Write a protein that binds this ligand. Structure first.
Ligand SMILES: C[C@@H]1C[C@H]2O[C@@H]2/C=C\C=C\C(=O)Cc2c(Cl)c(O)cc(O)c2C(=O)O1
Ligand SMILES: C[C@@H]1C[C@H]2O[C@@H]2/C=C\C=C\C(=O)Cc2c(Cl)c(O)cc(O)c2C(=O)O1
Ligand SMILES: *C(=O)CCCC[C@@H](S)CCS
Ligand SMILES: *C(=O)CCCC[C@@H](S)CCS
Ligand SMILES: [K+]
Ligand SMILES: [K+]
Lengths: 369, 93, 369, 93
C-alpha cells in the first residue's frame, strides 16, 4: 500500500463522450488506449480503495468489505504489471486485453457483495442517521467509479477484442441513439415483469418535442445500456405504483406517460404516473441505500455520471414525476469521477455537529393552558 | 487528589429554560473534545437543542445518563480532563 | 455587545401554526405573549447580528450593512428595556405594544437596504463563486429570521392592539384557508401587471384533488399572505415566460395550469407553464441572490419556513413546473429558524476546498490526433 | 541567510502529466496554510485539479504568477515559512 497511497494522490482523468467517440471512430489506436488505460485504471482503483479504508471500523470489518478490497488490490497489482511493458509488442497488447477481461469478470459480483456488506453492518450494529450519510457518500462514489471502470474496459475490449453485435456503434456508444426506441424497449421489459406478477400493467404513451428541429426523431450520442438501465427502473416503479393503487378500484388503469424533449443544452425525459405519489418527508430517503431497491439511487448515478441528473417530484395523493436530464451535446458530456483528496477525507472524518437550524421539542408546550 | 478536571454544568440554553432532558450524548468517554463539537441533544418544552462543547479536552466521565428527564440548571453533566492519560482517573468516582 | 454575545448563545424557540392558533383562539393572554416575546425577539435579533458580524469585511463595510446592524441594535436594546418590567401593569403591556410597532416600522426597509448592501459589494469587488455561497447562506438565514420576527409581531399586534379586517382569522392565521381562492387572487394580481405591460396574459386553469375527501374544497390552516406572496411570484414568472415565448407565434397562448392536491402529510401546489423552460445548468443559480428578482429565493424561504418547500423542474424547450409543498397538518408546521452556533460559525469561516469530484480541462486533449 | 523555508515544487499530479498551467492561486501571501487546504487550481490537457497544501505554515512568496501556462514538473511554485514573522523576509527575493 505504498503504491496505493501514491496512485490515490493522482487525479483521475475524466473523458467525454466526444473523446470516446472521436477516438474509436477516427483514431482507434490500440497503443494509445493501452498507454492511457494501464495508468488510469490503477488511478481509479486506488482513489476508491483509499476511501474504503476510511469506512467506520464496524463496516470495514465485514467479510464482504474485505473481499471487495482484496479484489481491488488483486486488480490493481495485475494492472501495475504493465507500467514498464512496451506497446511496440503485439503480445503485451494481447495479454493486456485478457487482463481487462479477467478484472471485469472479477468485478462482476461487486455491486451485490458490497451491498451484502452494508446489509450485514446495518443488521448487526443498527441504523444511525448520521453514519448513514457517510455510507451514502461512500456508495455513490464507489458505485460511480465502478460504472467508470466498466465504461473504459468495455470501450477497449469492444474496440480491440469479437461478435459484431451493434455495428454502427462505437464500442458501447451509439452516435445516433434514438431515445424513444430505448424508452419503448425499457418499457416493454418492465411491462413483462409487471404483467408476470400483477397479471396486468399500464399502457405507455410517448410524446416528443424536439425544439431544434420540431418534427425530427429525438437522437443523442450516448450509451444505450445506461439510458435503458435508468428507464427500466423508473418504469418498473411507475407500473408497480399504478397497479397497486388501482387494483381495488373501478376506473381502470391510467397510462404511464413519457415526454422526451430536446433543447440547446438538455435532453430531458419525464416519466409521469398517477400511482398515488410519496410524501415530501420521504423523498430524500429513497436515494439512501440503507433505508433500502438500490435501483433508484444507482439510476441517478448513471445520470450524474455524464453530467446529467435524475430528479423526483411527487404530489402525495395523486402521483409522481421522475425526470432524467442528459446533456444534448457530446462535447459537454464529461465523466464525473470521485477524486480522493483532503476534501474527500474530511467527509469520512466528520463527527456530528449541532444543527444549523432550529428543531422543536418532541413534546411542545400546550399553548391552550 | 484527582488530576485537573472541569465539570460541565447544564446552562440555561434559552432565556426561560429551567430544566432539560439529556436526550442523547454525542460523545463517548475517552474522546477528544474540540471547542464547538456537539456534546449532547438537550430537550426542553420549547426546543431540541444541540449543546456544544465549550472547552477542549477529553471526556472523562458522564455524570448524567442519556434519557434523564427534567435535569435542573447547574447540574454537572460530565467531566472533562486536559490529557487523555487522566481519563482513567475517573472510572473510579 | 456583551449582551449580544449572550443572547446569541441562546437557542430560538420555534413555534407551530397549531400553537399560534391554540394560543389566540383558546388562551389569548396578553401577559403570556409579552413574557414570551420580550425574550424571544432579542434572542432572534442577537442570533442574526452575530452572523452579520461574520460577513466578509468588504461587505460588512458597506453603509447599507452598517445601517441594518444599527437598526437591529436599536431594536434589541429597546426590547431589553422590558426584561424586568412586570406584566401585572396595564401600562407596561400598552408600552410594549407601541414598541413592537416602532420596531416593525423600523424594519420595513430592511429587505431592500440589505439587498442594496450586497449590490454595492458585488459592483465594487466583483463576483466570486465561492463567496457567493457564503452570502447566499447568510441571506437565506437573515431573510428567514426577518419573516419570523414579523410573524411574532403581527400575531401580538393583531391580537392585542384595531380595524377588524379578517374576522374569523386568528391574528394573521386563517383556520380555514381556501387554497384555490388564494390561487385565483394571486393570479388575478399578477395578470393585471402582466396585461399592463405586455397587453395580454395567459388564462389560469385550476384543478383540485383532495385525497382525504375527494370532492370537498381543499382547505388548510395557514397565513394567507405568505401563500399569496409565493403564488404571486410563480405566476408572474409563468406569465412572463408564456407571453415572451408566444408573442412572435401564431398558435395563441397556452394557459398557466395549477394542480392543488391534499394527502395525509402534504398540501402540494404545482404551477405548470409552457414558457419554454430553463436549462438544468442554470436552475440552482436562480435561487442565488447575487446572480439576481429576489422573488423566487424569498418565496422558497416562505415555504421552508413552516416546514414546507418550493421546488422547480423544467424541460428546456417546452416549459417549467414549480411546486409549493406545505404541511397539511398544523401540528406539524413548526417555524424553521436559523440558530447561531458553532455550525453556523463554520459556514462563515470556510476557506475554499478542493473539489471532491473531478473537473475536466477547459481545453481537453483532441482524441482524433 | 533567509529564515527556514520550503519550496513547493510542481508534482506530477496525474500519471502522464509533464507540465501544468497555474490557473488560479487560492491563497494569498501572508495566509496560514493548514495541511490539506486548497492552494491552486492547476490545469492540464486532461483535467483541472485542486492542488492541495502538503505542509503547514504561511505563504511567504508566490514564485509562479497566476495564468502562467505550461509550467514544467519540479518548478518551484511558492515559498512556505514556519512563523509569520518570517513572511517579510521574502518580499526581498
Ligand atoms: C412510494 C410510491 C409507490 C411505490 O410503488 C412504487 C414502487 C417503487 C418506488 C420507488 C421510489 O423510490 C419512488 C417512486 C419512483 Cl422512484 C418512481 O420512479 C415512480 C413512482 O411512482 C414512485 C412512487 O411514487 O412510489
Ligand atoms: C427563464 C424562464 C423564462 C423567464 O421568463 C421567465 C421569468 C422569470 C423567471 C424566473 C425563474 O427563476 C425561472 C422560472 C420560474 Cl421561477 C417560474 O416560476 C416559471 C417559469 O417558467 C420560469 C422560467 O422558465 O423562466
Ligand atoms: C487522454 O489521455 C486522452 C485519452 C484518449 C484515449 C481514450 S478515449 C482511451 C479509450 S478508452
Ligand atoms: C412557549 O413558551 C409557548 C409560547 C406560547 C405563546 C406564543 S404562541 C406567543 C404568541 S406570539
Ligand atoms: K487523488
Ligand atoms: K444560538
Amino acid at each position: 500500500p505504498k503504491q496505493i497511497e501514491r496512485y490515490s494522490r493522482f487525479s483521475p482523468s475524466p473523458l467525454s463522450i466526444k473523446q470516446f467517440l472521436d477516438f474509436g471512430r477516427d483514431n482507434a489506436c490500440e497503443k494509445t488506449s493501452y498507454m492511457f488505460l494501464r495508468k488510469e485504471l490503477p488511478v481509479r482503483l486506488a482513489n476508491t480503495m483509499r476511501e474504503v479504508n476510511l469506512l467506520p471500523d464496524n463496516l470495514l470489518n465485514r467479510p464482504s468489505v474485505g473481499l471487495v478490497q482484496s479484489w481491488y488490490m488483486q486488480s490493481f497489482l495485475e494492472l501495475l504489471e504493465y507500467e514498464n511493458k512496451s506497446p511496440e509488442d503485439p503480445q503485451v497488447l494481447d495479454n493486456f486485453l485478457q487482463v481487462l477481461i479477467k478484472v471485469r469478470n472479477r468485478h462482476n459480483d461487486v455491486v451485490p457483495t458490497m451491498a451484502q456488506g452494508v446489509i450485514e453492518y446495518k443488521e448487526k450494529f443498527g441504523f444511525d442517521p448520521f453514519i448513514s450519510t457517510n455510507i451514502q457518500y461512500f456508495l455513490d462514489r464507489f458505485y460511480t467509479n465502478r460504472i467508470s471502470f466498466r465504461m473504459l474496459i468495455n470501450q477497449h475490449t469492444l474496440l480491440f477484442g469479437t461478435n459484431p453485435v451493434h455495428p454502427k456503434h462505437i464500442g458501447s456508444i451509439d452516435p445516433t441513439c434514438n431515445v424513444a426506441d430505448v424508452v419503448k424497449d425499457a418499457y416493454e421489459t418492465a411491462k413483462m415483469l409487471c404483467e408476470q406478477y400483477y397479471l396486468v400493467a399500464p399502457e405507455l404513451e410517448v410524446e416528443e418535442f424536439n425544439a431544434k428541429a420540431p418534427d425530427k426523431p429525438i437522437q443523442v450520442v450516448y450509451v444505450p445500456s445506461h439510458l435503458f438501465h435508468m428507464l427500466f427502473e423508473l418504469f418498473k416503479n411507475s407500473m408497480r405504483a399504478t397497479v397497486e393503487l388501482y387494483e381495488d378500484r373501478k376506473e381502470g388503469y391510467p397510462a404511464v406517460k413519457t415526454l422526451v424533449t430536446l433543447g440547446k443544452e438538455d435532453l430531458s425525459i419525464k416519466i409521469s404516473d398517477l400511482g398515488g405519489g410519496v410524501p415530501l418527508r420521504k423523498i430524500d430517503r429513497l436515494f439512501n441505500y440503507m433505508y433500502s431497491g438500490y435501483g433508484l439511487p444507482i439510476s441517478r448515478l448513471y445520470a450524474r455520471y455524464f453530467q446529467g441528473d435524475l430528479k423526483l417530484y411527487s404530489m402525495e395523493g395523486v402521483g409522481t414525476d421522475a425526470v432524467i436530464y442528459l446533456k444534448a451535446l457530446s462535447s459537454e458530456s464529461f465523466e464525473r469521477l470521485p477524486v480522493f483528496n483532503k476534501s474527500a477525507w474530511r467527509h469520512y472524518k466528520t463527527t456530528p455537529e449541532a444543527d444549523d437550524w432550529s428543531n422543536p421539542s418532541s413534546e411542545p408546550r400546550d399553548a391552550s393552558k | 487528589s484527582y488530576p485537573p478536571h472541569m465539570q460541565v454544568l447544564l446552562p440555561a440554553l434559552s432565556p426561560t429554560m429551567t430544566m432539560g432532558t439529556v436526550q442523547r450524548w454525542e460523545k463517548k468517554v475517552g474522546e477528544k473534545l474540540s471547542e464547538g463539537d456537539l456534546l449532547a441533544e438537550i430537550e426542553t418544552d420549547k426546543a431540541t437543542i444541540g449543546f456544544e462543547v465549550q472547552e477542549e479536552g477529553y471526556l472523562a466521565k458522564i455524570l448524567v445518563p442519556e434519557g434523564t428527564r427534567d435535569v435542573p440548571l447547574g447540574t454537572p453533566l460530565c467531566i472533562i480532563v486536559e490529557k487523555e492519560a487522566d481519563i482513567s482517573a475517573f472510572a473510579d468516582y
